[PDB]
Design a protein around this ligand. Sequence first.
Ligand SMILES: [Cl-]
Ligand SMILES: [Cl-]
Ligand SMILES: [Cl-]
Ligand SMILES: [Cl-]
Ligand SMILES: [Mn+2]
Ligand SMILES: [Mn+2]
Ligand SMILES: [Mn+2]
Ligand SMILES: [Mn+2]
Ligand SMILES: [Mn+2]
Ligand SMILES: [Mn+2]
Ligand SMILES: [Mn+2]
Ligand SMILES: [Mn+2]
Lengths: 440, 440, 440, 440
Amino acid sequence: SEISRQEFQRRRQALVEQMQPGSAALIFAAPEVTRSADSEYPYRQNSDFWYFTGFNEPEAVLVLIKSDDTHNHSVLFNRVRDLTAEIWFGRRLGQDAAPEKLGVDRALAFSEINQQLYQLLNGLDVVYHAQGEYAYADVIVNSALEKLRKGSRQNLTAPATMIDWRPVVHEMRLFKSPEEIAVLRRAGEITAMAHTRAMEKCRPGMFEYHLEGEIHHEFNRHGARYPSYNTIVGSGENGCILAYTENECEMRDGDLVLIDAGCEYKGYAGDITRTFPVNGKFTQAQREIYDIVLESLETSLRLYRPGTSILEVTGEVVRIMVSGLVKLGILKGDVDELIAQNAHRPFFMHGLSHWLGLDVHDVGVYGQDRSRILEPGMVLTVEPGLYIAPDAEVPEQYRGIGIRIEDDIVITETGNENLTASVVKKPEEIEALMVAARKQ
Amino acid sequence: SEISRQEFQRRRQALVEQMQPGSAALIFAAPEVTRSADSEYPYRQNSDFWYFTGFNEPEAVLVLIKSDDTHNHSVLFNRVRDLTAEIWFGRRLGQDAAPEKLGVDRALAFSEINQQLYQLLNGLDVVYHAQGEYAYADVIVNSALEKLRKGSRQNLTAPATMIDWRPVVHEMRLFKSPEEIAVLRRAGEITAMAHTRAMEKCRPGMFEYHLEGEIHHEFNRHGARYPSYNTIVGSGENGCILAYTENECEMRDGDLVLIDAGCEYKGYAGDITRTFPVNGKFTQAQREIYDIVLESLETSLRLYRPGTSILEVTGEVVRIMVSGLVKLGILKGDVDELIAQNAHRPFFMHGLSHWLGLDVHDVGVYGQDRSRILEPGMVLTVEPGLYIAPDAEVPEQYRGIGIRIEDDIVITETGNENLTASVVKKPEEIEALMVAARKQ
Amino acid sequence: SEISRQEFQRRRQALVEQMQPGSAALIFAAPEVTRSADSEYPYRQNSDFWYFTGFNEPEAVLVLIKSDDTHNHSVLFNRVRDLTAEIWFGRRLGQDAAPEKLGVDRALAFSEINQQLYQLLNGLDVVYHAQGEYAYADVIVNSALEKLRKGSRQNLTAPATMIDWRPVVHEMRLFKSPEEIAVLRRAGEITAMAHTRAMEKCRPGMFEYHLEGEIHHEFNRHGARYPSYNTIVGSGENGCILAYTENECEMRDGDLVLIDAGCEYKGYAGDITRTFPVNGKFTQAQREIYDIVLESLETSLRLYRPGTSILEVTGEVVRIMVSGLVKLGILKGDVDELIAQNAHRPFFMHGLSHWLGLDVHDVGVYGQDRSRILEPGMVLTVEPGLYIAPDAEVPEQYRGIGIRIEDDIVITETGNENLTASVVKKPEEIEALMVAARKQ
Amino acid sequence: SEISRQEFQRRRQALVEQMQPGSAALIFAAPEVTRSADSEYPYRQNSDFWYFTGFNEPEAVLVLIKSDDTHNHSVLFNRVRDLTAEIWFGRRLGQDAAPEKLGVDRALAFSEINQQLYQLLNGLDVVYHAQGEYAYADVIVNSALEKLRKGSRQNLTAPATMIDWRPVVHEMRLFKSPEEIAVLRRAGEITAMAHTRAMEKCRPGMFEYHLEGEIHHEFNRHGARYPSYNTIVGSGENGCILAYTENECEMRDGDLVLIDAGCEYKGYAGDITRTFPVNGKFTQAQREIYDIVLESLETSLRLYRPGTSILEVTGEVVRIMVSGLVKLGILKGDVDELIAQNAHRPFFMHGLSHWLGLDVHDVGVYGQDRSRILEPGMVLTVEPGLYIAPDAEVPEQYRGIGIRIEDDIVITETGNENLTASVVKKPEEIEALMVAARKQ
Ligand SMILES: [Cl-]
Ligand SMILES: [Cl-]
Ligand SMILES: [Cl-]
Ligand SMILES: [Cl-]
Ligand SMILES: [Mn+2]
Ligand SMILES: [Mn+2]
Ligand SMILES: [Mn+2]
Ligand SMILES: [Mn+2]
Ligand SMILES: [Mn+2]
Ligand SMILES: [Mn+2]
Ligand SMILES: [Mn+2]
Ligand SMILES: [Mn+2]
């Protein structure tokens, strides 16, 4: 599953529909990023630029011009064909091929952007620009507007109104098309396969980074070359560090390992967390904490639907957590009083859910305290966890236990669809999977 | 093999030995780098900062103060311990543990650098600073010097002399210690294992990126988590693009694949290229080009030694290439006349060798046209290639063939040591390796 | 005559009337400007900031908040009272006195602008800001918007729309109130007195700068401390340099001197040019050129009125100039053909008229080729000139003659009022004035 | 008196003598400065650039190249001849005339500085540059060094050492040549004439700014077009504000007026302060404070000589002040105890002396607490004052009195020469001068 030229075009048209007549929208590509000295990190296109183009080159700018309420057109600035640059660094789309390939009306060399952009903006009323997104982009836009402002003797005029298109575009991104959901479903499947593999490969004495290696290889083999975020493999006390990425320790017989990893497939993020015993068998203490986190996740998965909110579901999770922690003696007191005091916060200190899409922490307005009412087409994670610090003032057997279990879901008309349920999470199923693997 | 605290300390002392009395050297850590939105790329420390510290955190500055010719000391600015930041993002060394861990005299919070740095520079004659390396660093240094310049009523004075330490430090880096050579030897071995694996796994119909996946998994399993540069897997006509990294094509029965890949092990780069038939058997045309490139590499490996130069060895390679291309009818004319006209350049358009170390294209002065005389302790690549474009005006059977073969060597008292000869390169050995793998 | 608190308030209200509900307008003071080392030029407030405040301090920001269509208020950020800063550098208005003195609702310390501005902008739909006017202002505004954009977890939101208020404000400035016209009338009178003085003081052997001295002293004595632009005193060939300000030459018996000078009175510019003989008597050649320029000015003064344009009046002037130059043999050919070829341009190369107000080249849209139809309340200069270069291919007696004659006018319902006719311009009146002075 | 081409050349040579072999010094002109909108302040050349050139244009850079210990040469970058720019804005020296006019070896267009500067710096060991002086200059220098650093394949190399030339140049400026002393002597005479005029013109009911007008006219008539700093005319309580420049009040019968004003003559500053009765007669209270300030000045003038210091002379002044204030009942207690407590500081809160030259607060190292031993050729002010605030807890008759009396001196072999004693300061002489003027 992928996103096609025609869908990128529909998105551009949907933006144009929202624009004022006599306006232009400017969407800039991500800069290349140095890793060390003359070597660069693998290129990652800006998500908003990607959303409107599917074009994976730097030094590119999409310009959507809405001349009036019926007439509009698109111009792409992009790198020119250049034999020498291409022999060295790779092929470039260039200007001749771009209109047909991408479905834009005109393409111009990026090297000419300062000579041409002001001409496209001249006489317009409004420019849509994400001010502050990139320095290089602000320089280009500010230079063009200055030429126009100062050019009255050449009959030039600048648009007086600049509107940030991020709020409009991020609201578009928040609601996925069926094609996007299909891509995210595949990302979920690929990510789940990787997590199953990690559980099947894990043995005491392996390093945390070995499981990262297994996961990344699995992503690759299905065509997801890069992860969507830096993979977390936190064994033992490291599982109590939320975004632990050092992954440098030897995994010990008797510890849990928490793996938070997700692929990037056609631009879209998977995001799964599983926690499991390094030796294939939960201890009693580990199981007691795990059961609370799993009940939190299972309850959330029953509840998420149009018309509820992340805030509302979080309330149910907090009750499950406080109730369970009281039963184990980790918290002491009356459940309702403890809930009123947010007594769970030392052990569950992050949010239950975030939006998911072209970014792992995806764009879109949450509302105050994540109170926004859910609607079909929203995609979000569900990620309860409990983290009992090595020095917590709790019964000793629970110290140093970090557990998170996370699935990705899409809100549907009828509830939600779980995109990541193909990797096991019930403790007996985890144990069975690992027992079967350990016998090979 | 690794680099130890005591070696980092010896390096700092070696720099101090070269500094003027009444001076301070300032070495800044790399900034964290955004990948998309709120997600960052995996952190890569600045190579020069790494060289003097082995410390893998951002927001850190090493200050070496040479008060006079016998008295000197070191101060590290680094991130403070912070429970909340650490629960979220990972542990920090902090100030209490840093002096013993790193072997510096004093450690101070990075948050206090603007309140403290000018106090360390006050009254010194010289500051060593890599101006222009990082914007954030220039801001800090410039602010401190301005405070001092403008602070005469508070009895403050700025050092009037600013010296770029890059030339001195890069000359240090150019000559490897035995410990560095041991690390590079392991990087070479790990990289060679990965290339052997790629040859054993390659089959027609696999995608170029599949071999990248195999290579990266092999790096990981030996403790080299990241590649030293973006892996190149160029099959067919893609092998004629020097740093092709798209790796997006299906590998065809009858094509060659060129793989240029290297691990980063304890900061140090491996860098190997092998070219081999996707189907395990070179065609006659492919073998004819391969033989010329291999003779170029084998001759270079015989010749490299103290007292020669990259320029001198390149001359021998150019003769081998022109002679071979004339024999096949790719070039026409008198060999010596063709050499005088640099007639090889359409087919071999890059350098034979680059320095190798903490960067894949490592630091250090080459001399005009890479004429610097070689000395023991220098580490360099040897990477002849021939690239016959799909549209080259040559006998048709050679069009679209891109071949490079690259080894990493260290210059010794007695010649050179090849760090990467554990992955095969003779065509009969490549074929035998692949035949054996294809039968499994 | 001056502009009062209540008028500044009416202007602020007039701007608020034009603003969208749920918006804030930000108007920043001019920075102080270094002359040399630690010495600054005399402070000149930004004209737009002045227009809305009459407040002559730096480090001040006026914020007009339009909460909805009936409710609005103003906040001033300005320097705090500070005994030491005030003993050294002068008194400051401060926060307690500002609301009553300036007629704003609230005043806050400038030192707190970064802690407070984002709070004022939070939740608004539109911010009016002159982007690119001042670097320091852009930094403040951009920082505030960034805090808001990134502050969703603190329930903060940024206005998505930024509108340049310059076009609206400059259209306000283009049409003067009766009070502004009264101030400009006084500026005209003061400037005219200075020009009369220069004519009465001029003698051969004085330096050009001596007349600048007389002019500036006259401005001062009437309470116009500073000129509105750098005074031009161009004698002989220097009169052919349009904005000659060196004023370094000894004025020669037999040369003309062109003086372009204007006061700044309560923020408003006078702008007069007179050209006259250094020795008090025009030569025949000088008179022949002078007569053409004077006829151009006199005709323009008859014609300027509501419903015509600078372009239209310029056409009449060009005909007068071409006709006169043909009669003297400076141009040769048919007048209408010469007009069609713009044959006057080597000798009259600037515009006839510019707007006049808080800036000498005042703000406001001219229309293409200065075609905008004139309306009552517009204030403009009328400044024909002829400049015959020392090396011009013309009859020799005209070479090196530079003449400009300039008056300031206000368009009225019934034509125009000349604000500067109290300094003579008829050649016989100039001669009589100088003869009378030279006899003393 | 002026500074000639040959002296500017001697200065350049004196700098070259101090430079390391294989070095270049870069000295940049001041930028033009906006006053309002498209109008600029009158141009003021950077003092250090002026010191080495006597060239009064912006967009100019002096480059002194010391190739080795016997060979050196100079290159000027400056604006090209351009007919249109010159018809509008004034004549330019250009490249053809510059070598002879200024005495430099070569001149190049400023428009070519980025194409040429790196070529001049290539292969040098040291660059002398005043980092942070001007943004535009830092951009040019940093760009050139970056081209060189990154240009090894084009055989380019950057100087690794950057030295601030300000300390060396400011030490040069601190010691005046006989020609400089002659210029400063004339500046002193011109400034003194202006102060005499102000005393002769002052009458009750005039505004403070009227005396500024008289002073500036007097500067102008002697060829000092601009003041060296903004003129201070502080009458009554305004005399207690040290750099009061509003000069907006009506001068009252019975008040003192303090005038601090100085001309700029051929680049050099005069700096005189006189305080006198607006009505021509000191009251008893005014005379009692005046006598203490005058004794302080007269004693300082007797004492200043080679081998003493500003700190040492200040000690004598503090004793005179504390002794006098005790006698009047403004201070109470034992003189030596009061001195030990710095009890004078509420009334004399600034320094006695500053260096004087191309800047009014001239360059040069003072030493801790202005302790540097004085030597012949140093030029400094002597400016005791007493300022009794309107609300001071002192006998009522002294409240609101601000008195400063300031002369400019040059240290000679034999003591000092007073450059400003031609304007009276003894109270009986002030009264006689004013009485004589008031009778006219
Ligand atoms: Cl391009
Ligand atoms: Cl910190
Ligand atoms: Cl403040
Ligand atoms: Cl130029
Ligand atoms: Mn998540
Ligand atoms: Mn996750
Ligand atoms: Mn290589
Ligand atoms: Mn390589
Ligand atoms: Mn004018
Ligand atoms: Mn004018
Ligand atoms: Mn002074
Ligand atoms: Mn003074």
